[PDB]
Enzyme design. Sequence first.
Site, PDB file in Angstrom:
ATOM      1  N   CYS A  64      -3.637  -4.380   6.703  1.00  0.00           N
ATOM      2  CA  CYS A  64      -3.702  -4.888   8.065  1.00  0.00           C
ATOM      3  C   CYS A  64      -3.064  -3.902   9.044  1.00  0.00           C
ATOM      4  CB  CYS A  64      -3.002  -6.245   8.197  1.00  0.00           C
ATOM      5  SG  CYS A  64      -3.230  -7.402   6.852  1.00  0.00           S
ATOM      6  N   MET A  65      -3.106  -4.272  10.324  1.00  0.00           N
ATOM      7  CA  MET A  65      -2.593  -3.406  11.380  1.00  0.00           C
ATOM      8  C   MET A  65      -1.120  -3.068  11.172  1.00  0.00           C
ATOM      9  SD  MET A  65      -2.882  -3.946  15.514  1.00  0.00           S
ATOM     10  CE  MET A  65      -4.663  -4.032  15.492  1.00  0.00           C
TER      11      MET A  65
ATOM     12  N   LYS B 115       3.803  22.460  16.078  1.00  0.00           N
ATOM     13  CA  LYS B 115       2.820  21.638  16.797  1.00  0.00           C
ATOM     14  C   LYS B 115       2.742  20.269  16.190  1.00  0.00           C
ATOM     15  CE  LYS B 115      -0.704  23.815  13.999  1.00  0.00           C
ATOM     16  NZ  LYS B 115      -1.478  25.066  13.860  1.00  0.00           N
TER      17      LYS B 115
ATOM     18  N   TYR C  21      -7.489  -9.777   4.759  1.00  0.00           N
ATOM     19  CA  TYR C  21      -8.706  -9.868   5.556  1.00  0.00           C
ATOM     20  C   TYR C  21      -9.942  -9.790   4.679  1.00  0.00           C
ATOM     21  CZ  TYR C  21      -6.338  -9.697   9.945  1.00  0.00           C
ATOM     22  OH  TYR C  21      -5.565 -10.026  11.025  1.00  0.00           O
TER      23      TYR C  21
END
Lengths: 378, 378
Positions: A317-318, A41, A271
């Site tokens: 960050c992203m 799964k 950030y």
Amino acid sequence: MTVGYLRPTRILVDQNAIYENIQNELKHLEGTDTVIFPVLKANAYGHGLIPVAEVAQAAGASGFCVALLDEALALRQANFTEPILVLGITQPSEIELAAANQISLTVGSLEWLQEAAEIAQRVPYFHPLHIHLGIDSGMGRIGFRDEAELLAADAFMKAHPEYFDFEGVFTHFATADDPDDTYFKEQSARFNQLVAVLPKKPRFVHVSNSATSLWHAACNGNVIRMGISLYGLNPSGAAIPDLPYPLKPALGIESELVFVKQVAAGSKIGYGATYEASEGEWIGTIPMGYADGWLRRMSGSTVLVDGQRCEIVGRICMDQMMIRLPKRYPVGTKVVFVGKSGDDEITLQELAEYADTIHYEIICDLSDRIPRVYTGLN
Amino acid sequence: MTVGYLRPTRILVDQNAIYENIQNELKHLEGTDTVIFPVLKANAYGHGLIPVAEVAQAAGASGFCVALLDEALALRQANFTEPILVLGITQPSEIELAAANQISLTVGSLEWLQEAAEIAQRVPYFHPLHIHLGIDSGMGRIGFRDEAELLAADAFMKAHPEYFDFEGVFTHFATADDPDDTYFKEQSARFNQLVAVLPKKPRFVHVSNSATSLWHAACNGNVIRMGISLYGLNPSGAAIPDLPYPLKPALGIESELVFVKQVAAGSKIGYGATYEASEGEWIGTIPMGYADGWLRRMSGSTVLVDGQRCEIVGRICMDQMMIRLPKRYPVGTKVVFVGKSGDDEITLQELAEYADTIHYEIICDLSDRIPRVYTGLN
């Protein structure tokens, strides 16, 4: 769903490790007729559904377990023909899809069977569903919780063989990886009490996740639903450190430095400007971020560069993060998130502990934006 | 990567919301020559790269920003012909792919340009790369940090117009969403200082993320890199509720109950048996787990069922979780994770607060195993 093949961030999956882990469990099982249904799964626990199914089949898997009908259909569409058990609840409206693709379904209530029979009765040329009755012996998730309804479900399938093939009965343990086995023993006694009301057992009787197979083998039925141990990870994290055979971790994670700079004291990084560098500090930038599954909670943990631990500094960050380097390194230098570097190693368990979670979640959270690269089978 | 269409767990994306958000920023920009390049990195912040690109195009986008060359190539392969800027570092070995697909590249060092020219010189028929110079004005991530290197990069591109088209210059702010603008003004002054020494500015000069365009619009260049606000979410979380125009959140999340039971006092629920029920409690099981991005840290938060708050009880599993129901509900009853139910509502900001993170991470961590369902445009 775009895969970042051109980005030098990669998940490395050692199929030889998976093959050895499964083969060791087969050896552990010798002298019984117990077979292994690997649990695939969640995109095979982030390792890749089809590539893991291929090596598991080569290693001796007799069937597969998945969470969703969609995952079982994906295996059939990749031309796997072994039994496949969907471990979660599939709504009765989807039984025609399951029956046409010979997908075995978990059923936890008489109501489900009644609803499925009403649907199947309207389907010309219907072929029977392969049913596993899920028994809730104390996990509290899904399944029957008393003898009466269990036997009523057994009777209902006997009344409607044109719709139902009673193929399995199973339960799942909440604490098989606990150094305290009190609740495990309670659940095992409860399952045994409940399955005892069945006049005749189905062909599969199964209770065992990885932890049950590793440390409670005397309670095995005739199928092992082998999950985390197939991927080479201790089910307990560190709670039960000793294993009946060695586990070889299958997954590593690597990237590269894409930017290297030296900065003056007080230079703010990331950030929110939450980190201030010291004088002459070397800062490396890595193309991996929280959108890849390296979540912001990983700030302050370490990666390995050239055998040296390097702290992730400032906010993640992203798509990118910054680390403190001990000296200048060329752009393109390998960064190891999971795996060995020099004389050191970062394990999934150590990362799970840093993140206040379990390694299952670390690997299941890895985005498909990271490509998986496989060793192949020796 | 297997998408769970048959499972009743879904992400709902309101494309009309995105359209209105973009149109409001366009109105906010009137009287300037500023255009919008929507930022679509990370599968358009979990909303779906191509569907969001389609509506952003309909709403007036002039170009797009992504994180990775692979994401830009996916947009070209979906027949988008607008300018596309890769915001992260693309390694010089991939310049032929960027050039052949007219993908603009972020460059943060003279060394990158030197390595790229060595590669491009060996390519017969090479066509020029569209370059944006990234300036590090205090984010500390990537980009030029001093006057001399910036001017050397500018002159180097001018020496090799066969390889390089100086198309843009940009920086990124670390604290544009901070009620204190002190560091923001330091970055903006530093960027303005560095760009002022360029002999001629390129066609795109841009500094603005969502927060910059919302609360520092006087500092906009001629392109807005509109990210989080396009998706209807406040860049600052809750730090700056004061907005120039309303934001309409684009994303909701819904599931269904797949199992419902009433349990006796003392019944233990979930892995580790960490939750003990009181007499007669109703327990619902939901086909959503941490492999979908509803991580274990969400235990103890609430979902909405029939307008009422329902606590996630016990541990969250890989594919399933359990909630306390106030009374019996039928299997198939809708569960709202994000969105409205009755007179109540759960927002992404509230969930991010519960999870000790930001809403950016909640949405980027949503697995592709959850299908996205789109409204389309009126």
